[PDB]
Amino acid sequence: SGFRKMAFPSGKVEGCMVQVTCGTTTLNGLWLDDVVYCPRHVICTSEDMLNPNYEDLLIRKSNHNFLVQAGNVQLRVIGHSMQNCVLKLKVDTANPKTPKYKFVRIQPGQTFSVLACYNGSPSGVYQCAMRPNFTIKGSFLNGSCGSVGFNIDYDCVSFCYMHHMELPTGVHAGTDLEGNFYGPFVDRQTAQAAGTDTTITVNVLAWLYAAVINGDRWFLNRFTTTLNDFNLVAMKYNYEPLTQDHVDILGPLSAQTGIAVLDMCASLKELLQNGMNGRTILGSALLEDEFTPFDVVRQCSGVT
Amino acid sequence: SGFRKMAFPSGKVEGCMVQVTCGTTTLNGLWLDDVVYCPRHVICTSEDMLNPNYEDLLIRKSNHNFLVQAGNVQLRVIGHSMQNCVLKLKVDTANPKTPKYKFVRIQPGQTFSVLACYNGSPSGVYQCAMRPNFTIKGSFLNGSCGSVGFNIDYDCVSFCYMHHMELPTGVHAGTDLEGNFYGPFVDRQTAQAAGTDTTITVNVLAWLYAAVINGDRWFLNRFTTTLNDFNLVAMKYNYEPLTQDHVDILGPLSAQTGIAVLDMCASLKELLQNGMNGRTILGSALLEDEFTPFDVVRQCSGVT
Ligand SMILES: *[C@](O)(C(=O)NC1CC1)[C@H](CCC)NC(=O)[C@@H]1[C@H]2CCC[C@H]2CN1C(=O)[C@@H](NC(=O)[C@@H](NC(=O)c1cnccn1)C1CCCCC1)C(C)(C)C
Ligand SMILES: *[C@](O)(C(=O)NC1CC1)[C@H](CCC)NC(=O)[C@@H]1[C@H]2CCC[C@H]2CN1C(=O)[C@@H](NC(=O)[C@@H](NC(=O)c1cnccn1)C1CCCCC1)C(C)(C)C
């Protein structure tokens, strides 16, 4: 028992990380098969960032302008293309350590593991959620661009995130592995507001189930509610509306604990209206929303 | 910027995990060179656990009583010895994926990465601290025994923890890789109280420095204090005494932020005496004590 913010084992990803240098800009790429993927702003000067025309900037580059370095050994770049906001650099060697993998776009409130990297060297792994406003609250320094987010779905690495930039609030934005930003962001140095951040209600309910499973029961009450009346209270505390699809995906946790989703919803209503009165749940003073129903099931049944 | 509970990349450890079976008991071992390390209670029946004589139980076992399984391929056990509470099983193959490694005993309040495993398959990585009472608040299910804790110190894996058992409070206990329990525990199914848990004061100060570095400054005040008067207030809130060695090891964070350790100590005194008044620090409502000074320096300077 116990409950931790747990990331996926990062070995399958650590063997795909490389250093990509173009001019004096060095960041990280993802070397799958015979393609190195990286943020396209690797081609930009600090002046270019103000208002880049990436097509004009990329046309001025040749294959030899890119240093791709897998550990010590230099890869030969034999071709470069642009897909949305990512560069795909063709190289002369397929990565032996290439695992089985898919590219996947995740939805607001899904979680993933970030392998934070500097100079193609993996430095750290942590778990986070795609916020409803499509930012992530990561930990990224200068040089972290091209670090990736992933899930491991039964020995298949699902890549969902490549790091591009940090907003002035200290939150993070980037793309899927086909180069489309999560959220309304563009890879240019202008003011770009993230939406209002909301609490991921389905995730909070998942974590309250995790608490019950671990014997933290004090917040259970005799009350019940409708989905409508819950969503009325939710919306007032800047919680995401809860949908029937959410209720469905909570079904398995409901079944295992024998607490109906709408009964648990009644516990959360009272917590929101009344606070925790100096109590904690799984040692937290705040309601946690970075665990999906599937994370709680995985960690509390123990899939490998 | 941003601040996350970050674990070490687990690839170097994932390549050392094996399944160890003896009778109907299956758990995890650590396969370094030509030795598989595992909890010695792998040899016990449920009846043996009440009061085992591990020497008598081990003498009744032969090399062929142990199934060591590296992924699919069965290792041949060619010799078995007992070191304190760990078994060392000699096998017929040295692990190619053996990284550079040391065995290290950590001190109360040091942090490490746990690779949680089931059936020799790595399932998850998280960061935690050795509590002052020598328990860890892990996430471990049935089958997790033999999962290991480690640090990566510049491509050298320092193994510090092997998982043995869970106390009724849902906290965890186990050994260093030479088989000595952390804390007063023994591998027997009897009542064994953990000490009083205290807050790791040096770690809280490290994290308050992390908050300043990330622009959370509201808790800084004009007051200062002596180490003595701080420790008087600390002891009352069940915080570990702060020592000059702690003040020294905080020096680098002090230098970078230009806030003397004893000035930061004055901020923490006021937080403890007055609470946070519904405010948060790095998004937490509670003071965080599972980051060492070295973790904050690593993550806020970005070593790989
Ligand atoms: C990454 O490229 C990297 O690791 N490079 C290696 C070191 C050489 C680097 C990593 C930081 C975590 N990212 C960037 O350099 C990105 C790119 C993409 C946009 C242009 C540059 C800037 N950038 C940033 O992350 C910056 N943030 C911003 O420029 C934001 N600026 C503003 O909010 C803004 C701008 N003008 C006026 C007013 N406000 C925006 C916000 C969201 C839209 C794009 C970026 C810094 C300042 C480096 C954090
Ligand atoms: C581990 O061996 C494993 O993964 N085995 C694979 C599935 C086959 C397993 C993992 C659980 C996280 N650990 C154990 O089986 C250990 C060993 C070591 C001590 C004997 C057994 C029991 N055990 C436990 O973790 C248990 N906990 C306890 O028995 C504790 N009991 C009490 O607190 C107690 C006992 N008698 C009376 C009153 N209270 C003690 C507490 C600290 C000293 C040693 C264990 C369970 C019940 C399995 C959690």
Side-chain angles (χ1 to χ4, degrees), chain A residues 1-153 155-304, chain B residues 1-153 155-304:
Chain A
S1 67
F3 205 74
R4 280 278 178 187
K5 205 154 273 156
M6 197 173 289
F8 285 98
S10 60
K12 285 178 174 58
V13 188
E14 300 163 38
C16 304
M17 299 309 303
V18 297
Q19 186 169 220
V20 169
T21 300
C22 175
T24 77
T25 298
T26 279
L27 35 75
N28 308 281
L30 188 67
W31 176 25
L32 300 176
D33 291 323
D34 74 327
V35 181
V36 174
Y37 299 75
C38 73
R40 67 179 172 168
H41 68 254
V42 75
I43 73 179
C44 295
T45 75
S46 304
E47 190 170 357
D48 285 326
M49 295 308 195
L50 285 308
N51 187 34
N53 181 332
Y54 284 101
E55 296 80 317
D56 292 359
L57 290 176
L58 187 54
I59 289 164
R60 297 198 232 294
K61 298 268 168 218
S62 292
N63 290 323
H64 64 68
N65 287 136
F66 300 108
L67 300 172
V68 181
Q69 196 168 327
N72 195 310
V73 331
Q74 308 210 157
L75 295 187
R76 168 172 319 289
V77 181
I78 68 155
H80 60 259
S81 43
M82 171 147 80
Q83 191 181 337
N84 299 302
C85 304
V86 306
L87 259 170
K88 305 151 86 203
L89 312 179
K90 203 163 190 167
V91 271
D92 81 321
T93 315
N95 198 324
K97 317 208 217 183
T98 304
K100 167 50 203 186
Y101 71 83
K102 328 214 311 307
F103 297 162
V104 304
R105 195 173 172 88
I106 59 158
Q107 302 253 300
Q110 304 201 256
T111 59
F112 57 96
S113 296
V114 172
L115 184 63
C117 295
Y118 304 89
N119 294 106
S121 291
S123 86
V125 60
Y126 57 88
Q127 184 79 351
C128 56
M130 190 48 83
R131 300 305 317 162
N133 69 0
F134 284 105
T135 64
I136 72 170
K137 309 203 197 171
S139 171
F140 292 116
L141 307 163
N142 251 293
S144 65
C145 290
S147 296
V148 287
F150 63 98
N151 284 285
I152 309 198
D153 175 349
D155 289 292
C156 172
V157 182
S158 276
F159 294 104
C160 56
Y161 181 79
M162 184 167 270
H163 187 52
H164 291 240
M165 56 215 193
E166 181 170 289
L167 316 190
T169 55
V171 305
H172 298 109
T175 64
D176 61 39
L177 259 296
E178 288 180 345
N180 290 313
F181 267 90
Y182 291 99
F185 309 111
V186 295
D187 47 357
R188 175 192 173 189
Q189 196 146 38
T190 56
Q192 311 179 24
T196 297
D197 205 7
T198 56
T199 304
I200 314 163
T201 314
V202 63
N203 287 5
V204 175
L205 291 165
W207 174 81
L208 291 179
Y209 279 108
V212 171
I213 291 162
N214 281 264
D216 257 30
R217 320 178 48 78
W218 66 261
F219 58 79
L220 299 175
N221 64 28
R222 63 167 201 286
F223 303 124
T224 204
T225 177
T226 72
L227 191 48
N228 193 81
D229 297 324
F230 173 76
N231 283 339
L232 283 184
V233 174
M235 289 167 212
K236 203 169 90 80
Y237 289 90
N238 269 305
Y239 276 58
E240 270 193 352
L242 194 73
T243 72
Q244 179 60 44
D245 313 68
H246 296 148
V247 176
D248 289 350
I249 270 140
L250 281 165
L253 285 171
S254 191
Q256 167 177 7
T257 55
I259 295 157
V261 173
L262 287 181
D263 291 342
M264 193 60 91
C265 280
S267 296
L268 174 52
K269 177 167 159 225
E270 282 303 328
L271 281 176
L272 284 176
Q273 283 169 347
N274 292 341
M276 288 182 63
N277 264 289
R279 312 188 66 172
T280 69
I281 297 164
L282 281 172
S284 186
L286 294 177
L287 301 169
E288 171 74 61
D289 76 346
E290 299 216 344
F291 301 96
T292 68
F294 319 84
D295 296 337
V296 175
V297 166
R298 275 203 269 301
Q299 180 177 164
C300 289
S301 289
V303 316
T304 48
Chain B
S1 67
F3 205 74
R4 280 278 178 187
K5 205 154 273 156
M6 197 173 289
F8 285 98
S10 60
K12 285 178 174 58
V13 188
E14 300 163 38
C16 304
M17 299 309 303
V18 297
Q19 186 169 220
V20 169
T21 300
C22 175
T24 77
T25 298
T26 279
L27 35 75
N28 308 281
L30 188 67
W31 176 25
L32 300 176
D33 291 323
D34 74 327
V35 181
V36 174
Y37 299 75
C38 73
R40 67 179 172 168
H41 68 254
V42 75
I43 73 179
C44 295
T45 75
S46 304
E47 190 170 357
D48 285 326
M49 295 308 195
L50 285 308
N51 187 34
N53 181 332
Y54 284 101
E55 296 80 317
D56 292 359
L57 290 176
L58 187 54
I59 289 164
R60 297 198 232 294
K61 298 268 168 218
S62 292
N63 290 323
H64 64 68
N65 287 136
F66 300 108
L67 300 172
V68 181
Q69 196 168 327
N72 195 310
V73 331
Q74 308 210 157
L75 295 187
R76 168 172 319 289
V77 181
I78 68 155
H80 60 259
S81 43
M82 171 147 80
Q83 191 181 337
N84 299 302
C85 304
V86 306
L87 259 170
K88 305 151 86 203
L89 312 179
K90 203 163 190 167
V91 271
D92 81 321
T93 315
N95 198 324
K97 317 208 217 183
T98 304
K100 167 50 203 186
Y101 71 83
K102 328 214 311 307
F103 297 162
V104 304
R105 195 173 172 88
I106 59 158
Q107 302 253 300
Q110 304 201 256
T111 59
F112 57 96
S113 296
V114 172
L115 184 63
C117 295
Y118 304 89
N119 294 106
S121 291
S123 86
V125 60
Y126 57 88
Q127 184 79 351
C128 56
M130 190 48 83
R131 300 305 317 162
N133 69 0
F134 284 105
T135 64
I136 72 170
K137 309 203 197 171
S139 171
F140 292 116
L141 307 163
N142 251 293
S144 65
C145 290
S147 296
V148 287
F150 63 98
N151 284 285
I152 309 198
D153 175 349
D155 289 292
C156 172
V157 182
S158 276
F159 294 104
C160 56
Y161 181 79
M162 184 167 270
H163 187 52
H164 291 240
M165 56 215 193
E166 181 170 289
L167 316 190
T169 55
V171 305
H172 298 109
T175 64
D176 61 39
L177 259 296
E178 288 180 345
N180 290 313
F181 267 90
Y182 291 99
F185 309 111
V186 295
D187 47 357
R188 175 192 173 189
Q189 196 146 38
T190 56
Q192 311 179 24
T196 297
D197 205 7
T198 56
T199 304
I200 314 163
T201 314
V202 63
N203 287 5
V204 175
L205 291 165
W207 174 81
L208 291 179
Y209 279 108
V212 171
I213 291 162
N214 281 264
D216 257 30
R217 320 178 48 78
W218 66 261
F219 58 79
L220 299 175
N221 64 28
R222 63 167 201 286
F223 303 124
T224 204
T225 177
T226 72
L227 191 48
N228 193 81
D229 297 324
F230 173 76
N231 283 339
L232 283 184
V233 174
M235 289 167 212
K236 203 169 90 80
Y237 289 90
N238 269 305
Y239 276 58
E240 270 193 352
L242 194 73
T243 72
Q244 179 60 44
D245 313 68
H246 296 148
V247 176
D248 289 350
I249 270 140
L250 281 165
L253 285 171
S254 191
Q256 167 177 7
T257 55
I259 295 157
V261 173
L262 287 181
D263 291 342
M264 193 60 91
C265 280
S267 296
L268 174 52
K269 177 167 159 225
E270 282 303 328
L271 281 176
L272 284 176
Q273 283 169 347
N274 292 341
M276 288 182 63
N277 264 289
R279 312 188 66 172
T280 69
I281 297 164
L282 281 172
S284 186
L286 294 177
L287 301 169
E288 171 74 61
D289 76 346
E290 299 216 344
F291 301 96
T292 68
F294 319 84
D295 296 337
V296 175
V297 166
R298 275 203 269 301
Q299 180 177 164
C300 289
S301 289
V303 316
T304 48

